[PDB]
Design a protein around this ligand. Structure first.
Ligand SMILES: *[C@@H]1O[C@H](CO[C@@H]2O[C@@H](C)[C@@H](O)[C@@H](O)[C@@H]2O)[C@@H](O[C@@H]2O[C@H](CO)[C@@H](O)[C@H](O)[C@H]2NC(C)=O)[C@H](O)[C@H]1NC(C)=O
Ligand SMILES: *[C@@H]1O[C@H](CO)[C@@H](O[C@@H]2O[C@H](CO)[C@@H](O)[C@H](O)[C@H]2NC(C)=O)[C@H](O)[C@H]1NC(C)=O
Ligand SMILES: *[C@@H]1O[C@H](CO)[C@@H](O[C@@H]2O[C@H](CO)[C@@H](O)[C@H](O)[C@H]2NC(C)=O)[C@H](O)[C@H]1NC(C)=O
Ligand SMILES: *[C@@H]1O[C@H](CO)[C@@H](O[C@@H]2O[C@H](CO)[C@@H](O)[C@H](O)[C@H]2NC(C)=O)[C@H](O)[C@H]1NC(C)=O
Ligand SMILES: *[C@@H]1O[C@H](CO)[C@@H](O)[C@H](O)[C@H]1NC(C)=O
Ligand SMILES: *[C@@H]1O[C@H](CO)[C@@H](O)[C@H](O)[C@H]1NC(C)=O
Lengths: 320, 238, 41
């Protein structure tokens, strides 16, 4: 998802100016269109989050005993000693990716709407997906969750990649140790090797840049004597003031139109990304994928979700 | 067959009563109508001119004075057309993505059986059927959903003669006293046998291996045949 | 008498899968489900 924004034409263009608002009425329903487009974008953001994360019928919990055949899920399981029961990796992600410019944006008709699902609910959904996938395997994604020992589920997955399950049963400690080493290296390689995790920051930066440019276009005269409506209204009679007011209206209408068009294109891109993330949650987390390189490099065994600011992180466990 | 018939009979109600979807096609129609209505309603805006009617401006002014109003109207209407076309292009991109998805669903859910999870409905996909709708398609996904689960004790392997046996295809289950081999998606318990198990190593490796009997059909059949052979011998020898 | 009320969202029912070292749940029945997906073309 991306930040939901709301823009008031009257405040942005003709802020608390009656003459400018009366002149702006002469341009028709441009602002009804801008408001409708932005509302669609915001509702689509909430839809994106709902489709990616609300994929569990029930909020599954892991049993109080956290033994899963020798596997170390503690760094991805929820941490109850916290206000939000975010995992270790989820908290690392939320600390690294972080969302006056904001006050100034809020000061001219540009507001930011909170998402419908709080970070606590996204964390709850991710925890339910994790508990379902480690206590039941892929059964919870196709009906009621059917419990199975984790070693036997791993034997299922080895069968699914073409290896006999006795290879897992006779190497269970080694496979558990390798998984624990890899899941312990994840906490470093997620923020040190970079690569990704720049997509979420890029989304945040693009949204902030768009808002900053929109509120900075209020300083352009666009050919008028001044960029301040109060100044023009104070220094001229109405017949001479309307010319400057109209230059400012044209410039600010253009700036708003450009902002909304860029937001629509970006929201289309983010909707494509969210559809991909939803498909990955369905086919990598809720099941085992035979599609090559869809759920990581190698023969896909399983995948685990973590929530990140405005996005999701998939830890793909594969056999090489 | 009865379950499928019941579900396909409930489809005719749940398609228009539960709502959920079928609002996407209506939303497409409504967005197109809204765009056209707004485009043709922008013809009433003066955009700073004396009037929004070209005939009025042409009738009330000489050409040199009329061109100013004509140009204001041209600028406003050019902007309205540009906005309409840009919104149409973005919407058509979205619809092309949706149509590519629908084509992939027709190929992989209707023309075949999909192993992709939740691609062709919730559950284990059996088949799918297409129906045409105004400006779109409807897929009736027929899937298999396990219904009445039961507890069992389970083991990764069975130890019989110092050898570990693993299921060829299934799981070992126990109601509490006896051990069977069942398929993982439907409880159909079968006697554990050398036919449905394979031997790998000894019993000192697998964690959770249990002791039970694995029956050899060859040995049992040989013993039963030798009993009849002994009877046939004793018929005349003794 | 009906009135407008506000509340916090319920994400769903609370379920604890009875995970154990050697417990497995096996289905003994099945259901044929016909669901619907509408796609704009
Ligand atoms: C599984 O069986 C082994 C072997 O025991 C033999 O086979 C059994 C089915 C039964 O017929 C026994 O009488 C046979 O001797 C068990 O290993 C034995 O463990 C006991 C107790 O520790 C020990 O006194 C014996 O010497 C062991 N026998 C051998 C050959 O090592 C094993 O404990 C059984 N597994 C379980 C989980 O009970
Ligand atoms: C499942 O079996 C494991 C061992 O195979 C159990 O883990 C042990 O639990 C006991 C107490 O119950 C502890 O003293 C041991 O230290 C644990 N061992 C390890 C390696 O963690 C586990 O408790 C069993 N039960 C469940 C419900 O998982
Ligand atoms: C599962 O993982 C956790 C954390 O990755 C392990 O906890 C660590 O245990 C060591 C050894 O006592 C401590 O020095 C660390 O400080 C612990 N880390 C944390 C974050 O608490 C835990 O031991 C692992 N469990 C098993 C059974 O191996
Ligand atoms: C498997 O499930 C089906 C469907 O619920 C069961 O069939 C029902 O059986 C009851 C009891 O006789 C009848 O009243 C219903 O009419 C049946 N439904 C249908 C659609 O035929 C069936 O009994 C279940 N099988 C087992 C072994 O429990
Ligand atoms: C499996 O056993 C647990 C523990 O008693 C129980 O809560 C659960 O309902 C059982 N499942 C079934 C399908 O009977
Ligand atoms: C387990 O199933 C077998 C096969 O019918 C039966 O003989 C045995 O008594 C069952 N055990 C229990 C506890 O029901």
């Amino acid at each position: 998802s991306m930040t939901k924004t709301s823009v008031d034409c009257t405040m942005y263009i003709c802020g608390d100016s009656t003459e400018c608002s009366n002149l702006l009425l002469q341009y028709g329903s441009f602002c009804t269109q801008l408001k409708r487009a932005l509302t669609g974008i915001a509702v689509e953001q909430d839809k994106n989050t709902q489709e990616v994360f609300a994929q569990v019928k029930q909020i599954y919990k892991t049993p109080p005993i956290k033994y899963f055949g020798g596997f170390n899920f503690s760094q991805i399981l929820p941490d109850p000693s916290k206000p939000s029961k975010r995992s270790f990796i989820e908290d690392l992600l939320f600390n690294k990716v972080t969302l006056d410019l904001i006050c100034a944006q809020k000061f001219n008709g540009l507001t930011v709407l909170p998402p419908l699902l709080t970070d606590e609910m996204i964390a709850q959904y991710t925890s339910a997906l994790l508990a379902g996938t480690i206590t039941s395997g892929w059964t919870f994604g196709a009906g009621a969750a059917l419990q199975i020992p984790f070693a036997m589920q791993m034997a299922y997955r080895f069968n699914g990649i073409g290896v006999t399950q006795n290879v897992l049963y006779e190497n269970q400690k080694l496979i558990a140790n390798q998984f624990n080493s890899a899941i312990g290296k994840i906490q470093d390689s997620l923020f040190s090797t970079a690569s990704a995790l720049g997509k979420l920051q890029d989304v945040v930066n693009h949204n902030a840049q768009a808002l900053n440019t929109l509120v900075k276009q209020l300083s352009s005269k666009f050919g008028a004597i001044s960029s301040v409506l109060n100044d023009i209204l104070s220094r001229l009679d109405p017949p001479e003031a309307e010319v400057q007011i109209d230059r400012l209206i044209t410039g600010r209408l253009q700036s708003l139109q450009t902002y909304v068009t860029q937001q629509l294109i970006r929201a289309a891109e983010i909707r494509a990304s969210a559809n991909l993330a939803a498909t990955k949650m369905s086919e990598c987390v809720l099941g085992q994928s035979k599609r090559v390189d869809f759920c990581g490099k190698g023969y896909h065994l399983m995948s685990f979700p973590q929530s990140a600011p405005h996005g999701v992180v998939f830890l793909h466990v594969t056999y090489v | 067959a009865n379950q499928f018939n019941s579900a396909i009979g409930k489809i005719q109600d749940s398609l228009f009563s539960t709502a959920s979807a079928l609002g996407k096609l209506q939303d497409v129609v409504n967005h197109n109508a809204q765009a056209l209505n707004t485009l043709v309603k922008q013809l009433s805006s003066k955009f700073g001119a004396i009037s929004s009617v070209l005939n009025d401006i042409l009738s009330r002014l000489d050409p040199p004075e009329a061109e100013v109003q004509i140009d204001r109207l041209i600028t406003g209407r050019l902007q309205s057309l540009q906005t309409y076309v840009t919104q149409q292009l973005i919407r058509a991109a979205e619809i092309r993505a949706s149509a590519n998805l629908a084509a992939t669903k027709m190929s992989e859910c209707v023309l075949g059986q999909s192993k992709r999870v939740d691609f062709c409905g919730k559950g284990y996909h059996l088949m799918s059927f297409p129906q045409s709708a105004p400006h779109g398609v409807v897929f009736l996904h027929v899937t298999y959903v396990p219904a009445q689960e039961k507890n069992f004790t389970t083991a990764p392997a069975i130890c019989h003669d110092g050898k570990a046996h693993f299921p060829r295809e299934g799981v070992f289950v126990s109601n509490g006293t006896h051990w069977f081999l069942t398929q993982r998606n439907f409880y159909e318990p079968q006697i554990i046998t050398t036919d449905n198990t394979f031997v790998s190593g000894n019993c000192d490796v697998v964690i959770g291996i249990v002791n039970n009997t694995v029956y050899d059909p060859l040995q049992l059949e040989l013993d039963s045949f030798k009993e009849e052979l002994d009877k046939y011998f004793k018929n005349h020898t003794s | 008498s009906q009135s407008i009320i506000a509340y916090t969202m319920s994400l769903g029912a609370e379920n604890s899968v009875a995970y154990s070292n050697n417990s497995i749940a096996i289905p003994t029945n099945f259901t044929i489900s016909v669901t619907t997906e509408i796609l704009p073309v």
